[PDB]
RNA sequence: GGCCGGUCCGGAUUUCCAACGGGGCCUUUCCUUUUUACUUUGAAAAAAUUAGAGUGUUCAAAGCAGGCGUAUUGCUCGAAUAUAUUAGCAUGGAAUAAUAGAAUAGGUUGGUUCUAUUUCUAGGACCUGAUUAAUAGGGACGGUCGGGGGCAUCAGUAUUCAAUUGUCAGAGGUGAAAUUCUUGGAUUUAUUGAAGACUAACUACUGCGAAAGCAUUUGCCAAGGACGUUUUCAUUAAUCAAGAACGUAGGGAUCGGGUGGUGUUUUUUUAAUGACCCACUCGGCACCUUGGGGGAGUAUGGUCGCAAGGCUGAAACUUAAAGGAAU
């Protein structure tokens, strides 16, 4: 296993070549959130388009905290959102064709990854306990 | 492992393998007191701070005086009349080198804390 | 404590500058809403349990006297010191390991009165919380990459079998032989067809997979790695009981990704965006140089063996035939 990571600058009076203001930015995120954008895409959209370097550092807080502050939060987070519904789309392709012991350990494997991220949120109790797989 | 554990770990095979300077991160204040009586003790050079935003980039210049230090796991309590005992089963000789303890007052070695008449719990140690 | 006049020709008046210290004090104005683990003091600590101290018991083991005066209201010393806790007492100081902490902090209706040249206006009620973002981590995304996997499909020429022929004594098989089949034409030759199996040469110290394993084409299904990233979350990590699914440093290359360079292969208004060389980088498979002491023996008056010897026949029978035997 190697690294392949962003590094954020040292920088955070960021950026100063940034004309535009900090409530376009604001009105840019809760237009692509309603537009239905995880919080990983809407920050992308605006790094890449209407170039933000990052949220958290020219708002002063960051996009799920801005996302609960206007009032359109997810329900679960978007990372077990993601694994759950990449498991209901493995455990979809291997009740399709059942031979493929290849995807059963890998679904082996994902809803382990599920359980361990699972737990981390019920001790932390962002969505409550009694959860356990939808 | 530890964070104070594996830079005592960095300098000490390193200056083993015999070189002038090291790096070490992360950095913690514990290990900034560590080094900092032993660069007044004598045993490494100057060092400098590195400070990004993440944890900091300690880095050591020292020559040949240092020759191990280490840390002590658990980290106990112990007594005016201990430190004397501590440093015979802790040290080569009894006027060489130092013990380090975590003590209440300030951070210190042996000799510091019985000359202020303090003590606390054992840290390291280096000689 | 220094610098400036203005009273008079060095004593009183004064401004500013510095150094200490003194006093009122600037910022929750709007809102419901710290203890524990360490160092010092005094009691409670029974001898037998230790050692310390004086003393010529004749010495020593043993034993514990203060004696002298002025034996007068006084001159002087040995029984000075030992865990008696782990469980236990009470008081005062502040790092690290926990722990309270931070009753963590703000920003959608109707009605009242005040306005001058219908403009245009001012005050009530009522109709969701706060470190950094590790060369810790998991997640998203982009272009990819792989004999990684599953399903479906395509291809190959072999092999086997069948058919159609053609020609004639041999043909598989063997170390020889034997055996097998062959004039009902085999083996071989040519043209097809069927069947399932398998993916040669390419194939390497190359690739992928958790391992076992994994090589035809195309399509689909999902997965995974690495890289890229000024994307997001914030310790989510690590390791195995139990259980679950599967059967020392350095160097040269090379694979996968990225960055930059600037020559050739390339091309040009259809979309896509190659190959090579060089450097740097990241990550890979590699390479090169750094259940008991025994055994060899030699011997064995023990102990268990073993070959034992010698014409059979043949003995109670000097006995035949026949067979070795010597010739």
């Known amino acids: ?134 | 492992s530890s964070v104070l554990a594996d830079a005592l770990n960095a300098i000490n095979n390193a200056e083993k393998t015999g070189k002038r300077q090291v790096l070490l991160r992360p950095s913690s204040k514990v290990i900034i007191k560590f080094l900092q009586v032993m660069q007044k003790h004598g045993y490494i050079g100057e060092f400098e701070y590195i400070d990004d935003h993440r944890s900091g980039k300690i880095v050591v210049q020292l020559n040949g005086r240092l020759n191990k230090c280490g840390v002590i796991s658990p980290r106990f309590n112990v007594k005016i009349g201990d430190i004397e005992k501590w440093t015979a089963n802790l040290l080569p000789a009894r006027q060489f080198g130092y013990v380090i303890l975590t003590t209440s007052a300030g951070i210190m070695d042996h000799e510091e804390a019985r000359r202020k008449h303090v003590s606390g719990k054992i840290l390291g140690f280096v000689y």
């Open chain 1, 1 to 134: 296993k190697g690294i392949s990571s962003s590094a954020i600058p040292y920088s955070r009076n960021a950026p100063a070549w940034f004309k535009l203001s900090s409530e376009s930015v604001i009105e840019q995120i809760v237009k692509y959130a309603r537009k239905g954008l995880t919080p990983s895409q809407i920050g992308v959209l605006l790094r890449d388009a209407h170039g933000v370097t990052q949220a958290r550092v020219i708002t002063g807080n960051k996009i799920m905290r801005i996302l609960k502050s206007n009032g359109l939060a997810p329900e679960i987070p978007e990372d077990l959102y993601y694994l759950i519904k990449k498991a209901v789309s493995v455990r979809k392709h291997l009740e399709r064709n059942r031979k493929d012991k290849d995807a059963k350990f890998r679904l082996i494997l994902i809803e382990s990854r599920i359980h361990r991220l699972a737990r981390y949120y019920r001790t932390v109790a962002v969505l409550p306990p009694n959860w356990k797989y939808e």
